[PDB]
Structure 1
Amino acid sequence: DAELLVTVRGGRLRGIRLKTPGGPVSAFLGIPFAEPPMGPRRFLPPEPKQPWSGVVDATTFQSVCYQYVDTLYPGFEGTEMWNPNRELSEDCLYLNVWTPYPRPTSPTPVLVWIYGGGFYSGASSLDVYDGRFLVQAERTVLVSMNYRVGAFGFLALPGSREAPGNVGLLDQRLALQWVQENVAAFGGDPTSVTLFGESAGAASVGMHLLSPPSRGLFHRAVLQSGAPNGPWATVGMGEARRRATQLAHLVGCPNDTELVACLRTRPAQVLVNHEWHVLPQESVFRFSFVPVVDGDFLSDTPEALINAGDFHGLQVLVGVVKDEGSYFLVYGAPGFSKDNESLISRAEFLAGVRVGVPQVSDLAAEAVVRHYTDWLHPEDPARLREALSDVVGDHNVVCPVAQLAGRLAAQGARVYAYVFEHRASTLSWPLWMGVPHGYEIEFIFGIPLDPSRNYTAEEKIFAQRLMRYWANFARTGDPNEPRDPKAPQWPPYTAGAQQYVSLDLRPLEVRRGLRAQACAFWNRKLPKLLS
Structure 2
Amino acid sequence: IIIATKNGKVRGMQLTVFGGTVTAFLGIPYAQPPLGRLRFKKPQSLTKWSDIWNATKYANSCCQNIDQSFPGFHGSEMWNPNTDLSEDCLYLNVWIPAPKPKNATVLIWIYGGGFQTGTSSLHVYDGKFLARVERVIVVSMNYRVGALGFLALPGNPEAPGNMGLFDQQLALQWVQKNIAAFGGNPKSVTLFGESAGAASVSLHLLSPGSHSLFTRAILQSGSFNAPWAVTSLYEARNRTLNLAKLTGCSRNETEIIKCLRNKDPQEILLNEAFVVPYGTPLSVNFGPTVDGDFLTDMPDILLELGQFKKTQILVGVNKDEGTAFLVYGAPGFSKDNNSIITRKEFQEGLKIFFPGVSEFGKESILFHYTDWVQRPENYREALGDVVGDYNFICPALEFTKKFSEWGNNAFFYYFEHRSSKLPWPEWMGVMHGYEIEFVFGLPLERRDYTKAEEILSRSIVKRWANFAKYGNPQETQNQSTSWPVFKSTEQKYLTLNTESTRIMTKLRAQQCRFWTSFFPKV
TM bracket (short chain): over 0.9
| CA contact 2:323–2:428 (8 Å) conserved in 1 | yes
**TM-score, structure 2 normalization:** 0.97
TM superposition shift of 1:352: 0.5
Q: What's 1:430 paired with?
A: 425
Partner Cα separation in structure 2 for residue 163 and residue 266 of structure 1: 15
Partner Cα separation in structure 1 for residue 212 and residue 240 of structure 2: 32
Pairwise mapping of residues 311-330 of structure 1 onto structure 2 (< 5 A)? Answer: 313-330=310-327
The alignment's C-alpha RMSD in Å is 1.6
User: 1:62-82, CA deviations, whole angstroms, 9 ceiling, x for partnerless residues?
Assistant: 000000011000110011100
TM superposition shift of 1:481: 4.2
Alignment CA distance shift 1:312-1:125 (3 Å): closer
Q: What's 1:220 paired with?
A: 216
From 3, 10, 18, the equivalent of 1:13 is: 10
| CA contact 1:108–1:187 (8 Å) conserved in 2 | yes
Identity over aligned pairs, percent: 53
Pairwise mapping of residues 463-478 of structure 1 onto structure 2 (< 5 A)? Answer: 463-478=457-472
TM superposition shift of 1:487: 12
TM superposition shift of 1:525: 2.3
Is the aligned partner of 1:331 residue 2:338?
A: no
**TM-score, structure 1 normalization:** 0.96
From 107, 117, 127, the equivalent of 1:131 is: 127
Whichever residue aligns with residue 278 of structure 1, its letter is V
Q: What's 2:436 paired with?
A: 441
User: 1:333-378, CA deviations, whole angstroms, 9 ceiling, x for partnerless residues?
Assistant: 111111111111111000101212231111211111110112575x
Aligned to 1:399, the other structure's residue is in SS state helix
TM superposition shift of 1:311: 5.7
TM superposition shift of 1:456: 1.5
Pairwise mapping of residues 17-56 of structure 1 onto structure 2 (< 5 A)? Answer: 17-56=14-53
TM superposition shift of 1:459: 1.2
Alignment CA distance shift 1:41-1:452 (3 Å): farther
Q: What's 1:269 paired with?
A: 266
Q: What's 1:116 paired with?
A: 112
Partner Cα separation in structure 2 for residue 376 and residue 493 of structure 1: 29
Partner Cα separation in structure 2 for residue 196 and residue 22 of structure 1: 27
Whichever residue aligns with residue 231 of structure 1, its letter is P
| CA contact 1:184–1:190 (8 Å) conserved in 2 | yes
Alignment CA distance shift 1:502-1:482 (3 Å): closer
Partner Cα separation in structure 2 for residue 260 and residue 312 of structure 1: 34
Is the aligned partner of 1:152 residue 2:145?
A: no
TM superposition shift of 1:11: 0.6
From 279, 291, 306, the equivalent of 2:276 is: 279
From 467, 470, 482, the equivalent of 1:489 is: 482
Is the aligned partner of 1:416 residue 2:411?
A: yes
Partner Cα separation in structure 2 for residue 525 and residue 54 of structure 1: 61
Is the aligned partner of 1:86 residue 2:83?
A: yes
| Ranges in structure 2 where 5+ consecutive residues have no aligned partner | none
| CA contact 2:205–2:308 (8 Å) conserved in 1 | no
Whichever residue aligns with residue 494 of structure 2, its letter is V
Aligned to 1:19, the other structure's residue is in SS state strand
User: 1:171-202, CA deviations, whole angstroms, 9 ceiling, x for partnerless residues?
Assistant: 00000000000001111100001000000000
Aligned to 1:403, the other structure's residue is in SS state helix
Partner Cα separation in structure 1 for residue 345 and residue 480 of structure 2: 49
Alignment CA distance shift 1:159-1:104 (3 Å): same
Partner Cα separation in structure 2 for residue 349 and residue 285 of structure 1: 17
Pairwise mapping of residues 86-485 of structure 1 onto structure 2 (< 5 A)? Answer: 86-105=83-102, 107-254=103-250, 255-310=252-307, 313-374=310-371, 380-453=375-448, 455-481=449-475
Partner Cα separation in structure 2 for residue 101 and residue 12 of structure 1: 19
Of stretches 502-511 and 83-92 in structure 1, the one that deviates more from structure 2 is 502-511
From 492, 496, 512, the equivalent of 1:499 is: 492
TM superposition shift of 1:239: 0.9
| CA contact 1:279–1:287 (8 Å) conserved in 2 | no
